[PDB]
Symmetry: D2
Subunit: 266 residues, 4 copies
């Protein structure tokens, strides 16, 4: 049964690009990919982080390829993509792990600032997808996986309209699946729930009487799983989405939330 | 055909409580109600606003009943409710127009602050509903209308978990409809789109070359209606929800958005 | 307050085409329209029905214009449309009330039969919409209302794929709203619940012991409204959708179901 | 990387009950489970089928345990369950593969017939779930997987109300996930698309000119994947749902549809 499990879930002989994965969530997702036989490629805006990245991967026994590129840089990404496509080879899997916009109150930011985020920052994951599609098509099999922002992510300002950008993960997932599914590309999403991170570690701090932090207690009650998400919880689900096992799954958002959205359906 | 239009859409001889409606959106919704024959009752946390309220209604030729109550005040609301029920009579229609929480970054606020918002602030619309149900049931017909925050509302911090409170409009709408529909109560919601307010008037400011503000231009492109919402757009829809015309409609969210959510469905 | 109620909800000086409305549901919807000041136009495949139609309308004190056309007839509908546009004038409101396909088991029907239903029968409401859009646009205001099949409709065979036709109400609603909302056309739907009809009157028959029919009892328990829908329940909601009151509502499915879909959300 | 792939996706030392899986879909799902190290248990209403079952499994090199039970038989299932729990041991995984009701037109069937389907036939998957929960809880880990009827399944009569039964997969999935997620049970669903079966093989028959059957051609156009589903496509997805890899996934419907639902979202 080793061969069966390998046939369906293995990522052997496949190049996987996971944007931003020099730490945190993208990182532990790439970690899981590597451990399933994938070749890891990732990026970040500045060199120091990339290095910290590779070091961190190495300590786990992973040879990662790390580049310096802004995901929002149009020409930059394309260069990074075909540069990967020689140094490392054809990208089989793209994990869009994009977000965390410069948090400037929508009334403080100038027209210049809007023009930027609307035209560039929000189109990032589309740019990166567009950059890697021609290859995947050539080779006859692609996996593009879009990771929605986790429900843990604090400080996000709700902007309903931004869901209508051509970038923007729920939209993008569905259009790429529709337009490019027939060239054997599967585009899907991960919807992470309340994933514990050091950022939200205060919201778990035990009280002076040793009772649970109020918010921590809310999350536990309202999550049927009765516990926070851990980054590791997204690992396997993401392989599944990157492996032959999900080849007839397209345009679907997989929610890794301990069933909280389902509790919101009673 | 005057009698027909009156039979289905009139709000004559019906008491309507619209929380917070001393200005802005709740105000223009109450304005429309009055003009359809309703009796207006509203509240606010402090007296000066209530007065400004009544003045504003009067100038339009509307006698409004204005009380001073915090929507979040448990005992306060109940008092306000039966006090209305003698001075003005049985509340037929409740318009929950609740939101705009003290915008303190979720990492700055203490456990005390969370304990408050989780247990009190988020349960407000449930408290106010609970306070007015026994009457509506007695009389044999209720309308509770929950107004989701408009897509125009800036500074809202996304907190997926808060949708699971028993207050919280999408949840509350569905439970009240389910539990109390058989006592002839119809609970539904309005989902306002990008409604122009003086707050977001900067986002409409014409540029130095006389071209459209970038964000303003986004909203127009992505809204099939090709224009922002105006408060007046919610008036009639809300009567409809408060009138005999919607008596076999329950647990439904009516979106007044110029079809932007539908564009997000391509 | 007569003028207010008229301004928002009246259908005066507006031509309304309601396909099939020579009896039943479309009929009582047209009945309500007329009573709100609309001019009624309707059709059917054969003359005898049309006549029965007009007679039925007349007895209620309504002058209806009745034509003979197959909704599926491409060239036929266009003729019927501009023929209406002279004899009666510009169609302001289109109510697509389309469905009830020849119930032949999907394995009994030949390729000829499929070719027909896929290419013609399912595109009907799109054909009729397409036929009336140029006028509505000219005049600067349209209402196209698509009436989903009621949950009462027995014998419907589930064919998930048919939702992907360009006809087909949920799809059509969203595309027309998106493409033509900016020419001030509002396209929306009614989703009728369990509407009592003489067809399903057996499912309400009291038992020999005077207890409720099992199915009748199911519907009452699972509908929060605790009763079946009546055709009349769709009347006002449909005006609302046809009146100035819903002008900033587009691409939305209004469910008139006594809150059963909401009970299915607990 | 064999140990990693085994840790997350293996079904070793786990008992899997897949109702009805003596042929067809449940069968190929069990086939895949076995090949991932699971122990297969299945049932059917009559002995001959069970035998045909075991034979079919054996030829593939699988020792299956086959019982005779009606899924709808209340007392019968419980017996079958604890009987399995000694002869085979604790059921770790339940795959509800329930449906295909006696297709009698809803107007032909008596109150007796309704009383049956409403109270018994529709509660089946709930009965079987209820029967296997106490064990899974004891052992500290359960997987209950509900397989929605495939979009391929012809002759299904649409009965919106039946979604409100406590059996009934979309409802059941969400309630079990909510109530029992905190005892470490993960309940989820598979939503199969247009899965090719010998039943619908006529709908794929090439025409006398060698062109594609009209319906076959529709499915290919409207499915972004551009091809029908095969039973094998549900195999891995179902393991994923049965394995440690999906432990923080609860109350979720996984659609294995080649992205057709997503095309219905444009």
């Amino acid at each position: 049964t080793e061969q069966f499990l390998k046939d369906n879930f293995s990522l052997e002989g496949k190049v996987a690009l996971i944007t931003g994965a020099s730490y945190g969530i993208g990182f532990s997702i790439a970690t899981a990919f590597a451990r399933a036989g994938a070749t890891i490629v990732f990026n970040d805006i500045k060199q120091e982080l990339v290095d910290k990245g590779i070091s961190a991967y190495k300590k786990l026994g992973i040879k990662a390829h790390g580049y310096v590129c802004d995901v929002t840089d149009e020409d930059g990404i394309n260069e990074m993509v075909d540069k990967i496509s020689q140094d490392v080879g054809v990208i089989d899997i793209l994990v869009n792990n994009a977000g965390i916009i410069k948090r400037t109150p929508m009334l403080e930011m100038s027209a210049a600032d809007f023009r930027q985020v609307i035209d560039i920052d929000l189109n990032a994951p589309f740019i990166v997808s567009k950059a890697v599609l021609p290859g995947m098509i050539q080779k006859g099999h692609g996996k593009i996986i879009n990771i929605c922002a986790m429900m843990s992510e604090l400080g996000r300002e709700t902007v309903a309209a931004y869901a209508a950008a051509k970038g923007g993960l729920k939209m993008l997932t569905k259009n790429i699946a529709s337009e490019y599914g027939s060239a054997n590309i599967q585009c899907n999403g991960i919807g992470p729930g309340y994933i514990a991170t050091p950022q939200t570690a205060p919201l778990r701090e035990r009280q002076d009487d040793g009772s649970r932090h109020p918010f921590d207690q809310f999350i536990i009650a309202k999550t049927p799983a009765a516990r926070w998400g851990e980054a590791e919880d997204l690992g396997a689900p993401a392989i599944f989405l990157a492996s032959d096992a999900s080849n007839f799954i397209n345009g679907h958002i997989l929610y890794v939330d301990g069933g909280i959205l389902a509790y919101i359906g009673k």
